[PDB]
């Protein structure tokens, strides 16, 4: 149950962002042992919310902290909210949360990239309250992303910095006590007419509802009094890639009111094409990251607008949420700009045996299904989402992974019978044991970088050969979901060398030549959109330098050649 | 007399380069007053030759030195040289030289970019000798480049750093006592046959001489026993831009032997065109500088080859020896590679009243004529030189500059009737007073940088309008001899901004569009070839950054766009 909070005449949002008080444990779980939540925090510093905490201070100990940290602020409940339902919402807490209201625990959460909330109607006092949030960053074999602890040092095999903090907005909001809990929308098209299937869940199903469908002019085009209905939109304005159209499911229920934007669009996979509204779609874009200077993974909407301007400028039509769900604000923006999205759960780091009883096991599986349920509940109504990605680069050569991912694939397909399912490959085509469960084959391939570094002449034959093998083995359309080269801005050389701006351009260009000679490729996603931070390592010059743009969102040389190609496509 | 030294059966060269001993004056002219030359130098450091001294040490006092420094080394005269004529040659000493041999002064020279020599046949001893060289860097109103001293601080209004030292090889060489002193070669073409007019001077004009003209496979194609003659070369292999062919004037005189490469090629200026061998030539290239890391203006032949590879790669066909004569090794390289050269004397810095009796006056004028004579005598036989430039950016709006440059132009025309004469403009077209004396009008224009900085849309109309005015006022073909923009490697921005790599490309692009619409433009020379060092100033980020290549000879982004254009012309 996770409708995005709204403001209208009936519902109201109180943002709890700004500056909080903050302190870290000085030994493992010190805050829980000493019950720091039972009184205000002492010996604290300021910490912005939303933001990672790791890059804010000058303190290497805080940057590299392993374990739990403690946030605290105060909030008020006005007299005017006296008889309302009160909800405290967290867009995310990375990775693990324990929430305390006035010294008492009210909820917990596992998973750093999906929202959660707590009903505090009967617990919050009028006037001042104290909100205390314990934030833990430890990843074990039953978390997503996967990791483990050694003796404490945090180990993991994914390539992005394990930022921790309150990365997304914290909201206290009110609704009437009889209210709209959940909404599902599915759409079909018969030539010119759209059909809108909706289902609305309330906590008083016998009472009266009024449902409108409004166009972008806010004009009513359909109307009903049923909580579940199928309604026809004559001459429907379809939601198109690069040309969004959003209708509004506008719902009056008792004293309550909720308005849900949605797009009318169809998806169909053929043998070798990806069809949106019947017309072939070729993915041009990037896997991204929630990453920028100072604030780590913290939501930054000005950064988001800049990134969308860059995506439009360079001719991209799509992105993948590597390697975790992004903020709903980004998903709303993609809905509005007509950007096509591959939505991914954080099942990353399942690589180096990995699928064994003492590591990635049935407990990991059950949590993997739960994360998918939550992702679906949050994003099921976004027209921008066209595909679910259930994993990034698992060690799928292991025979034990076959049963694991058959279970995961069956689960998401039971939740959602309409969008294709996929996941990205890094093992050899000959060894993979899971891609047969997918509708689209996605491969991460770094010819000219991790294979044959510097050997420009070998990139084109290498990727073409591999692509054909992937198509011959599975007979499905193929997306190259990652390829590129680390590139230091300002590093030029003639003849070109790895890390130079010229090499990045040539590397991408030869990979593209291989893709252009295949008839079953339905997309190219360059890695990476922008330089981002990684865990420290000798192959990472202050992070991952595969960005086509710098971390400050300025283009390297290759960006202009990619634009010339994508704008002609 | 200044024939380039050669090695053969009769003549021998001894290089005196390597590591010398070095010391600077601690007060003005300390070394002269204390007669340091009378005994070996004491309290010295090592200094390499050839090289500037400014960038070698970690000492700011030496880098910014004003006045004189002292070089010394030892050389040997072999027993085997017993009865030969002995000559000490300096390729250059910047700017002023006093030469001592075994403690006695033997010659002086004024001007930092042209060679000079001294006959030491009767003054060097068999075995060890001591060679001492005083090197002065002070420029006054009668030097070229122009400058002046204020109270000691050196002032000047040219860009580049006032490097000083022994910048070109020092050579002791030997010839027989009766020998070839000078050679002048001129060529004409009648349809398919070439006519080689030569004049040879010796110090015994009555003695027998034998003169061969040899082709590139060293086979005799013409023969004569005259000191001055006119011999036919049937079916002559012409020297062409991009395809050099060099004949050899191979001269046997008594015991002496000298071999002089030369090329057969015609130059003709028409209304609107610059014809070489009767075919229109469009200059594509750069003004350069003698400048690189560590060694300042020191000759570096490895760097010279790299620059010619770069010029070839980028599609250039020419350069101008911006603001002073270059080393002969580079002129020889241009002869062999077919690179067309504009050869320029150091009349730079006559700008801020400049042409007054207390500044640039008749003493300056007479020295300017002498430098031209020395330049002509050195470079008259190079087929690569197609045009003389007698000044760079003088304040030619002053009425007094008219008689000055009419006199300079008429002098150079008497020395050489075959090659066109020019000089580069920076004053406004309405105020210029000297360009009517030239055969080609050369303008330095920085629209988008020094005028309307950052205003990309104003570049094309401004340049086209100025170009038309120059053509209409003088009716001669036009070269844009400088244009461009400072650019920090690695500085990228979208939208572009001055100093970014993207801006340099667009600025050059928009200037090129203006030139392409003008049927009277016969050349474009971008400023600059490579980043180089300047006197310190708030507009100069560790030198002039207008290079298309960095100072380490690697390309910035714009280099690739220039290459596409120049290579399809
Ligand atoms: Ca959110
Ligand atoms: Ca020389």
Short mmCIF file of N, CA and C in Angstrom, two decimals, chain A residues 7-129:
data_model
loop_
_atom_site.label_atom_id
_atom_site.label_comp_id
_atom_site.label_asym_id
_atom_site.label_seq_id
_atom_site.Cartn_x
_atom_site.Cartn_y
_atom_site.Cartn_z
N UNK A 7 -1.15 16.76 -2.25
CA UNK A 7 -1.76 17.92 -1.61
C UNK A 7 -3.03 18.30 -2.35
N UNK A 8 -4.15 18.38 -1.64
CA UNK A 8 -5.37 18.92 -2.24
C UNK A 8 -6.23 19.52 -1.12
N UNK A 9 -7.53 19.68 -1.37
CA UNK A 9 -8.39 20.25 -0.34
C UNK A 9 -8.57 19.30 0.85
N UNK A 10 -8.38 17.99 0.66
CA UNK A 10 -8.59 16.98 1.69
C UNK A 10 -7.31 16.44 2.31
N UNK A 11 -6.23 16.33 1.54
CA UNK A 11 -4.96 15.78 2.00
C UNK A 11 -3.91 16.88 2.01
N UNK A 12 -2.96 16.78 2.95
CA UNK A 12 -1.94 17.81 3.11
C UNK A 12 -0.60 17.17 3.50
N UNK A 13 0.49 17.73 2.99
CA UNK A 13 1.84 17.19 3.18
C UNK A 13 2.64 18.15 4.06
N UNK A 14 3.34 17.60 5.04
CA UNK A 14 4.30 18.35 5.83
C UNK A 14 5.68 17.76 5.57
N UNK A 15 6.55 18.54 4.92
CA UNK A 15 7.90 18.08 4.60
C UNK A 15 8.77 18.17 5.85
N UNK A 16 9.50 17.10 6.14
CA UNK A 16 10.40 17.09 7.29
C UNK A 16 11.86 16.97 6.86
N UNK A 17 12.30 17.79 5.92
CA UNK A 17 13.66 17.71 5.39
C UNK A 17 14.54 18.69 6.15
N UNK A 18 15.30 19.57 5.48
CA UNK A 18 16.13 20.51 6.20
C UNK A 18 17.30 19.85 6.93
N UNK A 19 17.65 20.43 8.07
CA UNK A 19 18.85 20.07 8.84
C UNK A 19 18.42 19.28 10.07
N UNK A 20 18.96 18.08 10.22
CA UNK A 20 18.70 17.27 11.40
C UNK A 20 19.95 17.23 12.27
N UNK A 21 19.77 16.75 13.49
CA UNK A 21 20.88 16.41 14.36
C UNK A 21 21.29 14.97 14.08
N UNK A 22 22.56 14.67 14.34
CA UNK A 22 23.19 13.46 13.80
C UNK A 22 24.36 13.04 14.67
N UNK A 23 24.50 11.74 14.88
CA UNK A 23 25.72 11.20 15.48
C UNK A 23 25.87 9.74 15.09
N UNK A 24 27.11 9.27 15.02
CA UNK A 24 27.34 7.87 14.69
C UNK A 24 27.64 7.05 15.93
N UNK A 25 27.32 5.75 15.86
CA UNK A 25 27.78 4.81 16.87
C UNK A 25 29.30 4.84 16.94
N UNK A 26 29.84 4.73 18.16
CA UNK A 26 31.28 4.57 18.34
C UNK A 26 31.69 3.13 18.55
N UNK A 27 30.73 2.23 18.78
CA UNK A 27 30.97 0.81 18.64
C UNK A 27 29.69 0.20 18.10
N UNK A 28 29.79 -1.05 17.65
CA UNK A 28 28.67 -1.69 16.97
C UNK A 28 27.41 -1.67 17.83
N UNK A 29 26.36 -1.04 17.30
CA UNK A 29 25.04 -0.95 17.92
C UNK A 29 25.03 -0.17 19.23
N UNK A 30 26.01 0.72 19.44
CA UNK A 30 26.05 1.50 20.67
C UNK A 30 24.74 2.22 20.94
N UNK A 31 24.10 2.74 19.89
CA UNK A 31 22.86 3.47 20.08
C UNK A 31 21.74 2.59 20.63
N UNK A 32 21.65 1.35 20.13
CA UNK A 32 20.63 0.43 20.63
C UNK A 32 20.95 -0.03 22.05
N UNK A 33 22.23 -0.29 22.34
CA UNK A 33 22.62 -0.74 23.68
C UNK A 33 22.34 0.33 24.72
N UNK A 34 22.69 1.58 24.42
CA UNK A 34 22.53 2.67 25.36
C UNK A 34 21.20 3.40 25.20
N UNK A 35 20.29 2.87 24.38
CA UNK A 35 18.93 3.39 24.26
C UNK A 35 18.93 4.90 24.02
N UNK A 36 19.77 5.32 23.06
CA UNK A 36 19.92 6.74 22.75
C UNK A 36 18.60 7.39 22.36
N UNK A 37 17.67 6.61 21.80
CA UNK A 37 16.38 7.16 21.38
C UNK A 37 15.49 7.60 22.54
N UNK A 38 15.75 7.16 23.78
CA UNK A 38 14.79 7.45 24.85
C UNK A 38 14.86 8.89 25.33
N UNK A 39 15.89 9.63 24.96
CA UNK A 39 16.03 11.04 25.27
C UNK A 39 16.64 11.71 24.04
N UNK A 40 16.57 13.03 23.94
CA UNK A 40 17.19 13.72 22.79
C UNK A 40 18.66 13.34 22.62
N UNK A 41 19.13 13.40 21.38
CA UNK A 41 20.52 13.03 21.12
C UNK A 41 21.45 14.12 21.63
N UNK A 42 22.60 13.70 22.16
CA UNK A 42 23.62 14.61 22.67
C UNK A 42 24.94 14.34 21.97
N UNK A 43 25.76 15.39 21.86
CA UNK A 43 27.03 15.33 21.14
C UNK A 43 26.79 15.00 19.67
N UNK A 44 26.05 15.90 19.01
CA UNK A 44 25.58 15.71 17.65
C UNK A 44 26.20 16.78 16.77
N UNK A 45 26.07 16.58 15.46
CA UNK A 45 26.42 17.57 14.46
C UNK A 45 25.21 17.75 13.55
N UNK A 46 25.28 18.74 12.67
CA UNK A 46 24.23 18.96 11.68
C UNK A 46 24.39 18.03 10.49
N UNK A 47 23.26 17.53 9.97
CA UNK A 47 23.29 16.68 8.80
C UNK A 47 22.08 17.05 7.94
N UNK A 48 22.28 17.34 6.66
CA UNK A 48 21.13 17.68 5.81
C UNK A 48 20.33 16.44 5.48
N UNK A 49 19.03 16.65 5.29
CA UNK A 49 18.13 15.60 4.82
C UNK A 49 17.30 16.23 3.71
N UNK A 50 17.19 15.60 2.53
CA UNK A 50 17.80 14.33 2.12
C UNK A 50 19.25 14.46 1.65
N UNK A 51 20.09 13.47 2.00
CA UNK A 51 21.50 13.43 1.61
C UNK A 51 22.15 12.17 2.16
N UNK A 52 23.19 11.67 1.49
CA UNK A 52 24.08 10.72 2.16
C UNK A 52 24.85 11.49 3.22
N UNK A 53 25.31 10.80 4.26
CA UNK A 53 26.15 11.49 5.23
C UNK A 53 27.64 11.39 4.91
N UNK A 54 28.04 10.54 3.96
CA UNK A 54 29.45 10.14 3.86
C UNK A 54 30.36 11.25 3.34
N UNK A 55 29.85 12.16 2.50
CA UNK A 55 30.69 13.17 1.86
C UNK A 55 30.47 14.58 2.41
N UNK A 56 29.72 14.70 3.50
CA UNK A 56 29.41 16.02 4.06
C UNK A 56 30.55 16.52 4.95
N UNK A 57 31.17 15.66 5.74
CA UNK A 57 32.16 16.15 6.70
C UNK A 57 33.57 15.95 6.18
N UNK A 58 34.53 16.48 6.93
CA UNK A 58 35.95 16.34 6.63
C UNK A 58 36.56 15.11 7.30
N UNK A 59 35.74 14.19 7.76
CA UNK A 59 36.12 13.15 8.70
C UNK A 59 36.13 11.79 8.00
N UNK A 60 37.33 11.23 7.80
CA UNK A 60 37.42 9.92 7.16
C UNK A 60 36.69 8.84 7.96
N UNK A 61 36.65 8.95 9.29
CA UNK A 61 35.96 7.94 10.10
C UNK A 61 34.47 7.90 9.79
N UNK A 62 33.84 9.06 9.63
CA UNK A 62 32.43 9.06 9.28
C UNK A 62 32.23 8.58 7.85
N UNK A 63 33.08 9.03 6.92
CA UNK A 63 32.94 8.62 5.52
C UNK A 63 32.91 7.10 5.40
N UNK A 64 33.85 6.43 6.07
CA UNK A 64 34.03 4.99 5.99
C UNK A 64 33.29 4.21 7.08
N UNK A 65 32.34 4.84 7.79
CA UNK A 65 31.64 4.18 8.89
C UNK A 65 31.01 2.85 8.47
N UNK A 66 31.05 1.88 9.38
CA UNK A 66 30.40 0.59 9.21
C UNK A 66 29.45 0.38 10.38
N UNK A 67 28.16 0.24 10.10
CA UNK A 67 27.20 0.07 11.18
C UNK A 67 26.06 1.08 11.17
N UNK A 68 25.73 1.64 12.34
CA UNK A 68 24.55 2.48 12.50
C UNK A 68 24.93 3.90 12.85
N UNK A 69 24.10 4.83 12.38
CA UNK A 69 24.15 6.24 12.74
C UNK A 69 22.73 6.64 13.16
N UNK A 70 22.62 7.82 13.79
CA UNK A 70 21.40 8.26 14.45
C UNK A 70 21.08 9.67 13.99
N UNK A 71 19.87 9.86 13.46
CA UNK A 71 19.34 11.17 13.08
C UNK A 71 18.23 11.57 14.04
N UNK A 72 18.03 12.88 14.22
CA UNK A 72 16.93 13.35 15.04
C UNK A 72 16.48 14.75 14.65
N UNK A 73 15.17 14.96 14.62
CA UNK A 73 14.64 16.31 14.52
C UNK A 73 13.32 16.34 15.26
N UNK A 74 12.73 17.53 15.33
CA UNK A 74 11.39 17.71 15.87
C UNK A 74 10.41 18.12 14.77
N UNK A 75 9.14 17.77 14.97
CA UNK A 75 8.06 18.23 14.11
C UNK A 75 6.82 18.51 14.94
N UNK A 76 5.90 19.29 14.37
CA UNK A 76 4.69 19.71 15.07
C UNK A 76 3.44 19.16 14.39
N UNK A 77 2.44 18.82 15.20
CA UNK A 77 1.11 18.51 14.70
C UNK A 77 0.21 19.69 15.05
N UNK A 78 -0.33 20.40 14.06
CA UNK A 78 -1.17 21.57 14.36
C UNK A 78 -2.53 21.16 14.93
N UNK A 79 -3.10 22.06 15.73
CA UNK A 79 -4.48 21.90 16.20
C UNK A 79 -5.42 21.58 15.05
N UNK A 80 -5.21 22.20 13.88
CA UNK A 80 -6.11 22.03 12.74
C UNK A 80 -6.15 20.60 12.19
N UNK A 81 -5.22 19.74 12.59
CA UNK A 81 -5.19 18.36 12.12
C UNK A 81 -5.87 17.39 13.10
N UNK A 82 -6.70 17.90 14.00
CA UNK A 82 -7.09 17.15 15.20
C UNK A 82 -7.69 15.79 14.87
N UNK A 83 -8.65 15.73 13.95
CA UNK A 83 -9.35 14.46 13.76
C UNK A 83 -8.96 13.75 12.47
N UNK A 84 -7.75 13.98 11.99
CA UNK A 84 -7.31 13.38 10.74
C UNK A 84 -6.49 12.13 11.01
N UNK A 85 -6.36 11.32 9.97
CA UNK A 85 -5.39 10.24 9.96
C UNK A 85 -4.01 10.83 9.65
N UNK A 86 -2.99 10.43 10.42
CA UNK A 86 -1.65 10.98 10.30
C UNK A 86 -0.67 9.88 9.90
N UNK A 87 0.14 10.15 8.87
CA UNK A 87 1.08 9.16 8.32
C UNK A 87 2.46 9.78 8.22
N UNK A 88 3.47 9.06 8.70
CA UNK A 88 4.86 9.48 8.55
C UNK A 88 5.48 8.66 7.43
N UNK A 89 5.94 9.32 6.38
CA UNK A 89 6.45 8.62 5.21
C UNK A 89 7.94 8.89 4.99
N UNK A 90 8.67 7.83 4.72
CA UNK A 90 10.07 7.87 4.31
C UNK A 90 10.16 7.39 2.86
N UNK A 91 10.60 8.27 1.95
CA UNK A 91 10.87 7.83 0.58
C UNK A 91 11.94 6.75 0.50
N UNK A 92 12.94 6.82 1.38
CA UNK A 92 13.89 5.72 1.58
C UNK A 92 14.80 6.04 2.76
N UNK A 93 15.39 4.97 3.32
CA UNK A 93 16.46 5.07 4.30
C UNK A 93 17.44 3.95 3.97
N UNK A 94 18.71 4.30 3.72
CA UNK A 94 19.70 3.37 3.18
C UNK A 94 20.72 2.99 4.24
N UNK A 95 20.79 1.70 4.61
CA UNK A 95 19.99 0.61 4.05
C UNK A 95 18.86 0.12 4.97
N UNK A 96 19.04 0.26 6.28
CA UNK A 96 18.11 -0.29 7.26
C UNK A 96 17.67 0.81 8.22
N UNK A 97 16.41 0.77 8.61
CA UNK A 97 15.85 1.84 9.42
C UNK A 97 15.17 1.28 10.66
N UNK A 98 15.28 2.03 11.76
CA UNK A 98 14.40 1.89 12.92
C UNK A 98 13.87 3.28 13.25
N UNK A 99 12.55 3.41 13.35
CA UNK A 99 11.91 4.71 13.53
C UNK A 99 11.37 4.80 14.96
N UNK A 100 11.59 5.95 15.60
CA UNK A 100 11.14 6.21 16.97
C UNK A 100 10.38 7.53 17.01
N UNK A 101 9.21 7.51 17.64
CA UNK A 101 8.41 8.71 17.85
C UNK A 101 8.31 8.94 19.35
N UNK A 102 8.85 10.07 19.81
CA UNK A 102 8.84 10.44 21.23
C UNK A 102 9.39 9.31 22.10
N UNK A 103 10.50 8.71 21.66
CA UNK A 103 11.19 7.70 22.43
C UNK A 103 10.69 6.27 22.28
N UNK A 104 9.60 6.04 21.55
CA UNK A 104 9.04 4.70 21.35
C UNK A 104 9.17 4.27 19.90
N UNK A 105 9.57 3.01 19.70
CA UNK A 105 9.74 2.48 18.35
C UNK A 105 8.39 2.27 17.68
N UNK A 106 8.25 2.77 16.45
CA UNK A 106 6.99 2.64 15.72
C UNK A 106 7.09 1.82 14.45
N UNK A 107 8.26 1.67 13.83
CA UNK A 107 8.39 0.77 12.68
C UNK A 107 9.87 0.56 12.36
N UNK A 108 10.14 -0.43 11.51
CA UNK A 108 11.46 -0.70 10.96
C UNK A 108 11.33 -0.99 9.48
N UNK A 109 12.48 -0.99 8.79
CA UNK A 109 12.47 -1.26 7.36
C UNK A 109 13.82 -1.80 6.93
N UNK A 110 13.80 -2.75 6.00
CA UNK A 110 14.99 -3.34 5.43
C UNK A 110 14.98 -3.07 3.93
N UNK A 111 16.02 -2.40 3.43
CA UNK A 111 16.06 -2.05 2.02
C UNK A 111 16.23 -0.56 1.80
N UNK A 112 17.30 -0.17 1.11
CA UNK A 112 17.66 1.23 1.10
C UNK A 112 17.07 2.07 -0.01
N UNK A 113 16.18 1.53 -0.84
CA UNK A 113 15.78 2.27 -2.03
C UNK A 113 14.28 2.26 -2.29
N UNK A 114 13.46 1.89 -1.31
CA UNK A 114 12.01 1.85 -1.49
C UNK A 114 11.33 2.47 -0.28
N UNK A 115 10.18 3.12 -0.47
CA UNK A 115 9.58 3.89 0.62
C UNK A 115 8.93 2.99 1.66
N UNK A 116 8.58 3.60 2.79
CA UNK A 116 7.83 2.93 3.85
C UNK A 116 7.19 3.99 4.75
N UNK A 117 6.13 3.60 5.44
CA UNK A 117 5.41 4.58 6.23
C UNK A 117 4.87 3.94 7.50
N UNK A 118 4.37 4.79 8.39
CA UNK A 118 3.84 4.38 9.69
C UNK A 118 2.66 5.28 10.03
N UNK A 119 1.53 4.66 10.40
CA UNK A 119 0.35 5.39 10.86
C UNK A 119 0.57 5.85 12.30
N UNK A 120 0.62 7.17 12.52
CA UNK A 120 0.89 7.72 13.84
C UNK A 120 -0.31 8.51 14.39
N UNK A 121 -1.51 8.23 13.87
CA UNK A 121 -2.72 8.94 14.28
C UNK A 121 -2.90 8.93 15.80
N UNK A 122 -2.72 7.77 16.42
CA UNK A 122 -2.97 7.61 17.84
C UNK A 122 -1.69 7.73 18.68
N UNK A 123 -0.60 8.26 18.11
CA UNK A 123 0.67 8.32 18.82
C UNK A 123 1.24 9.73 18.84
N UNK A 124 1.02 10.50 17.78
CA UNK A 124 1.57 11.85 17.74
C UNK A 124 0.78 12.75 18.67
N UNK A 125 1.48 13.63 19.37
CA UNK A 125 0.83 14.65 20.17
C UNK A 125 0.61 15.89 19.32
N UNK A 126 -0.48 16.60 19.61
CA UNK A 126 -0.62 17.96 19.15
C UNK A 126 0.57 18.78 19.63
N UNK A 127 1.07 19.68 18.78
CA UNK A 127 2.29 20.37 19.12
C UNK A 127 3.53 19.52 18.87
N UNK A 128 4.54 19.73 19.70
CA UNK A 128 5.88 19.25 19.38
C UNK A 128 6.02 17.75 19.56
N UNK A 129 6.72 17.12 18.61
CA UNK A 129 7.08 15.71 18.69
C UNK A 129 8.56 15.57 18.35
#
